Every structure is written in structure tokens, then in C-alpha cells.
């Protein structure tokens, strides 16, 4: 395993594969926020941005230099700041921001700019030699939240829908659907067996075990 951050301390990235990396930034309240960096033959793909354009730009610049290839696409799992805060930057630089039609709407509501809203309940994307599946399991952390699946490495990106082993709380639930939340988690476990690793938007990376944990918190 390897960890490497920029010369400001703001942003840090960590490797999972010859192709998969995890970015993490802070938003003092300090609250770490994480997403993915997909290193593909035909460009770089971000799974979820960061708290604000400030950090987003700083991130792109960092990885685009490190990997010597452009960030072509990004995927937005839901319309909250920790996920979509850099949407203005993505659209400035001509990056494709994918999302569900719903996530797109809720972005307008929250004073952000709108992603594409081109994803379905199940969407299969391919960026070079990289296969990426987006899945909408139902309401939970928010009503629009989705998960991302990487078939080649059996890696699941939980987002804010999945709590880390270190998370004792449910966090903010102002926009959460606490009953459907359990069902949605079922829908994911049903769809993806043999899960290699699971990535929570906040906290350390884990396995199929974080799903059971989140369910514990919903009891
Ligand atoms: Zn959220
Ligand atoms: Zn969150």
C-alpha cells in the first residue's frame, strides 16, 4: 500500500490497484471525505468530487500531473456538498459529470450546477479498459444516492449510503430515509456477492462487513 498527498496537505490519494485510487480531502467541522480515481487507458475518471471547487481543482491538477492524462469523466453519487461540491469546476473544464436524473434535480435545489442526469437504475459505463456499473438501490442517506461497482476488481463504492467501521453515528439524516435505507442496503448485498472491497465516503475502507454494520445502526 502507498499514500501520497500534494504539497499543501489538503488532498491525499491512495492506491488499491494498478488502476484504482482513493482520494480524500477535509472540511473542518476536520471531516475527511473520500472518493475514487480510476486510471484508464483513455483518461482519468473521478468517482465523486469534493467539498468545494477550491479542493476539486487542487485535486484534478494533482492527479492529472501524477498520471499524465486528462480527467475525462466524473460520477456523482448524490447531490450533497461532499459529493458534488466541485461541480462548477468539472463543467468549466469540460468534464462529463454523470448522475441520475434525480440527483441532477436535487443539485439545482441545493444551489449547485446540474450534472448530466444520464444514469438509470442500472447503467454500464466503459472508459477504455475500465468497466463501471452505477446502481440505484433505493432511498437511504438521501433519496437520490447511488453506488458504483467495478466488476474487474469487485470493488463497491458505498458513498454516504454506507457507514465505515469507525462510524458510530448515522451522521446527518435531515435528508435520509431511515426505513427504506435498510432495504436499499439489502438490494445491494443481493446484487453484489463476492464483494472484494467496499469504499465509504467517510472513514477507512472495508469489506462486505460494512454493509452489515450500517444495518446495525439502522436498527
Ligand atoms: Zn450526503
Ligand atoms: Zn456525507
Q: What sign does the CA torsion over 27, 84, 153, 10 have?
A: negative
CA–CA distance, 125 with 189 (Å, rounded to integer): 21
- Residues assigned a catalytic role: 78, 80, 82, 141, 172
Domain boundaries in the chain?
A: 1-219
Ligand nearest to the CA of 202: 2
CA 2, 171, 1: angle at the middle one, nearest 5?
A: 10
As a whole number of Å, the end-to-end CA separation of the chain is: 35
What is the rounded CA–CA span in Å between residue 155 and residue 176?
A: 24
Pairwise CA distance, residues 136 & 174, whole Å: 20
Q: Give the contacts of 183 (CB within 8 A, at least 6 positions apart).
A: 138
Rounded Cα distance, 3 and 48, in Å? 19
Distance in Å, CA 201 to ligand 1 centroid: 9
Closest listed ligand to the CA of 169: 2
Q: Of 126, 131, 130, 134, nearest to 158 (Cα)?
A: 134
Ligand nearest, relative to CA of residue 200: 2
DSSP, residue by residue, 82-142: HHHTTHHHHHHTT-EEE-BHHHHHHHHHTT-------B-SEEEEEETTEEEEEE---SSSS
Residue 43 Cα to ligand 2 middle (Å): 27
Q: Which residues are annotated as a binding site for substrate?
A: 163, 172
| Ligand 2 mean position, distance from CA 41 (Å) | 30
Report the separation in Å between the CA atom of 129 and the middle of ligand 1, taken as the mean of its atom positions: 30
CATH T-level fold of 1-219? Metallo-beta-lactamase; Chain A (3.60.15)
In order of 4, 132, 204, the CA distances from 73 in angstroms are 22, 12, 25
Determination approach: X-ray
Q: Ligand 1 being an ion, which residues bring their Cβ within 5 A of it?
A: 80, 160
CA angle 51, 160, 114 (to 5 degrees): 55
Amino acid at each position: 500500500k502507498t499514500v501520497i498527498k500534494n504539497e499543501t496537505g489538503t488532498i491525499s490519494i491512495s492506491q488499491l490497484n494498478k488502476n484504482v485510487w482513493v482520494h480524500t480531502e477535509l472540511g473542518s467541522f476536520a471531516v475527511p471525505s473520500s472518493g475514487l480515481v480510476l486510471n484508464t487507458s483513455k483518461g482519468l475518471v473521478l468517482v465523486d468530487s469534493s467539498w468545494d471547487d477550491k479542493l476539486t481543482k487542487e485535486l484534478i491538477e494533482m492527479v492529472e500531473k501524477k498520471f499524465q492524462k486528462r480527467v475525462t469523466d466524473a460520477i456523482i453519487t448524490h447531490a450533497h456538498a461532499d459529493r458534488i461540491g466541485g461541480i462548477k469546476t468539472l463543467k468549466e473544464r469540460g468534464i462529463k459529470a454523470h448522475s441520475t436524473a434525480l440527483t441532477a434535480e436535487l443539485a439545482k435545489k441545493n444551489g449547485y450546477e446540474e450534472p448530466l442526469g444520464d444514469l438509470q437504475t442500472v447503467t454500464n459505463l466503459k472508459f477504455g479498459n475500465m468497466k463501471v456499473e452505477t446502481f440505484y438501490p433505493g432511498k437511504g442517506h438521501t433519496e437520490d444516492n447511488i453506488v458504483v461497482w467495478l466488476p474487474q476488481y469487485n470493488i463497491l463504492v458505498g458513498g454516504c449510503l454506507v457507514k465505515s467501521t469507525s462510524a458510530k453515528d448515522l451522521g446527518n439524516v435531515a435528508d435520509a430515509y431511515v426505513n427504506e435505507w435498510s432495504t436499499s442496503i439489502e438490494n445491494v448485498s443481493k446484487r453484489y456477492r463476492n464483494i472484494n472491497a467496499v469504499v465509504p465516503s467517510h472513514g477507512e475502507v472495508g469489506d462486505k462487513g460494512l454493509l452489515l454494520h450500517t444495518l446495525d445502526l439502522l436498527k
